[PDB]
Amino acid sequence: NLTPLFEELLQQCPPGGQNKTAHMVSAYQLAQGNWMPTSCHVFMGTISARRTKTHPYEAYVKLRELVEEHKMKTLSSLGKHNDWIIGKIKYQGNLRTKHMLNPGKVAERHNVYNKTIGSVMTATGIRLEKLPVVRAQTDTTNFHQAIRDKIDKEENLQTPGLHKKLMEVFNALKRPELESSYDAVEWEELERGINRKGAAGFFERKNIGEILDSEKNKVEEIIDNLKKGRNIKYYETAIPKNEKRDVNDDWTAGDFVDEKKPRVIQYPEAKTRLAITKVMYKWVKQKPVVIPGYEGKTPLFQIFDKVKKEWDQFQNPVAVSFDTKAWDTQVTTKDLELIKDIQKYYFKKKWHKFIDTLTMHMTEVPVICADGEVYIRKGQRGSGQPDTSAGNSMLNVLTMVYAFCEATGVPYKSFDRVAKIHVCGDDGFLITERALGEKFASKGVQILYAAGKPQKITEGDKMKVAYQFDDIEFCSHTPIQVRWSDNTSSYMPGRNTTTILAKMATRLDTIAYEKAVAFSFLLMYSWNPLIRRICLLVLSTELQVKPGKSTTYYYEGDPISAYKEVIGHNLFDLKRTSFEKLAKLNLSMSVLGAWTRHTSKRLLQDCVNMGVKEGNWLVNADRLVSSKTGNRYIPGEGHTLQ
């Protein structure tokens, strides 16, 4: 017989659940005969069978090949940790990627017009038909090509020994007063500013709020294992821009943040977003600001006021822009390893394992598409990661300081003595003397390729150089200057009049909201009289209704006093808007034909026709309206919130 040799292998065949779905044969009736396996796993002494007339040796012959087959799949590809995603596959994958993995698939918001604000515009002659559309979506056929055109690529060639020279740079701007101090935050500070409707991962069913409401302990798990050193089932989810699941966990300082978003948004599970944030809150939100020149916490109206205070100190100043062609897909793995080392400098000793583990996942990122198509990302930064704004910024300044010093020979220590730098994620610029700025302008497009951050096509391979202050571009705005009553000057954030009217009149699937929008726009665009007069005309409607709260800002009490609180001047005090700069930004209106010759005066007459009746009328907040209407506006106490 052969059973004494069959008991040998049985005490080696892997365990399994005793399944009665078929025939579970004996540890000895195998050597009987005609009982050959079709599966291996033992139920404390059984396997499958087939009644296939096998010889007492043909049984052992087959079974030992399954044990060889099991000791093989168990004990490559798809990462050294991400191997779990193979289970969730069911179909073969059509994505046609040439530079990264693609193992199959898994089982798988219209924008509307503002009633009040839009009606106001049409009444003056503004043709909304001739205005840019600012919320278009995209087809999935177009979406699939977007991944092949932008995302699937081998990590760019970062020059030998570069990430040492980048640490050489960070060593200068390090903050020893904060070294090894950061810690996890309590659930209250994290929850304070959080969007209760944050998007959920592909395998998730509840959103950021419900995760907080019910399974707050499940997030505490992800935090523990990561802090202990265990691999977690890290996945990211990929959706196109303006998809119903493109939702920000934090507050955007303007409608421009969602605008400098890439076509392809990658975000981890909502439970994972909170796990990272309840820990790294001090870095990701950048609660103390550490990356020099990071303006993500700065509000829009002072962004250029703060800068002109530095531009006015250089004997002959110039500015240079960072146009990194699609920055998010330009991040090598040594980069994530660098930001990892940075995060360890300011975080406590207990939390390094959290940083060590999480970074390992962020290098080999498995990303599930909207239709189920799963791909493996060759590094790069997911645009929806918690570390995006924080990490990208630190990466921008370290690269751009390197590129500046490398093109000009200025030591890394002596950088602040010859230049100032401002960034926001990947967008930013850099101010210095005319002499130095030209070197970094020409040699820059080269040195930046060497680092792996390729500039755009540009002109003659020279970076964008701003010679006069008001030619700077930052956060999709440009500096425009206003002159107040008391003859002072101050720069406000400027933009194209069409691009503002487009973003102001549209929604995304409510008079209170219409007013909070008009106030939020007045803080930034009171320099544009066509827009100031619109905002006053909407705010002066239905003064009973308190304003909304879902937009960037809103007001508590009297808006003309809230404006005073944040701008440092009353809207009445706006005496003159810069002559030349207001031409350039109004010009897009005439080329598109969005206004008429009579539009400028017609908007003004409606304000004068409103605030001429005896009393205290909002529209009188305009300097000229009040000027020809005789009255003034006396506002009570008002404040600004978000």
Numbering used by the authors: 13 to 87, 91 to 123, 131 to 531, 538 to 670
Give passages from the manuscript.
Compared to the RdRPs of other Flaviviridae representatives such as the NS5 of the Japanese encephalitis virus (JEV) and dengue virus (DENV) in the Flavivirus genus and the NS5B of the hepatitis C virus (HCV) of the Hepacivirus genus, the pestivirus NS5B contains a unique ∼90-residue N-terminal domain (NTD) that does not have notable sequence homology to any other viral or host proteins. The global conformation of our CSFV NS5B structures is consistent with the recently reported CSFV structure with an RMSD value of 0.9 Å (95% coverage) between the reported structure and our representative C-682 structure. These structures together reveal that the NTD adopts a globular α/β fold with an α-β-α-β-β-α pattern. The NTD interacts with the palm of the RdRP core intra-molecularly with a mixture of hydrophobic and hydrogen bonding interactions. Collectively, these biochemical data indicated that the RNA synthesis fidelity of CSFV NS5B is fine-tuned by its NTD through the intra-molecular interactions with the RdRP palm.
To better understand the nature of the NTD–RdRP intra-molecular interface interactions and whether they regulate the RdRP fidelity, we designed point mutations at the Y471 and E472 sites in the context of the WT NS5B and the N- and C-terminal deletion mutants. The other two structures, obtained using the C-672 construct bearing the Y471A-E472A double mutation (C-672_AA) and the C-672 construct with the E472A single mutation (C-672_E472A), were solved in a space group different from those of the WT, C-682 and C-672 structures. Very interestingly, the C-672_AA and C-672_E472A adopt a drastically different global conformation with the NTD–RdRP interface no longer maintained (C-672_AA structure shown in Figure 3D). The NTD–RdRP intra-molecular interactions are fully disrupted, and the NTD is rather involved in a non-intensive three-way interaction involving two symmetry-related neighboring NS5B molecules in the crystal lattice. As suggested by the two open conformation crystal structures (C-672_AA and C-672_E472A), the NTD–RdRP disengagement might occur in solution. The effect of E472A mutation was highly consistent with AA mutation (compare lanes 4/8/14/18 to 5/9/15/19), while the effect of Y471A mutation was slightly smaller than that of the E472A and AA mutations (compare lanes 3/7/13/17 to 4/8/14/18 and 5/9/15/19). As a small and unique globular domain, the NTD is connected to the RdRP through a flexible five-residue linker that could allow global NS5B conformational switching leading to disengagement of NTD and RdRP, as suggested by the two crystallographic conformational states identified in this study. Although NTD–RdRP disengagement, a situation mimicked by the crystallographic open conformation state in a crystal lattice or the N-91 construct in solution, results in fidelity reduction, engaged NTD–RdRP with perturbation from point mutations can achieve similar level of fidelity reduction.
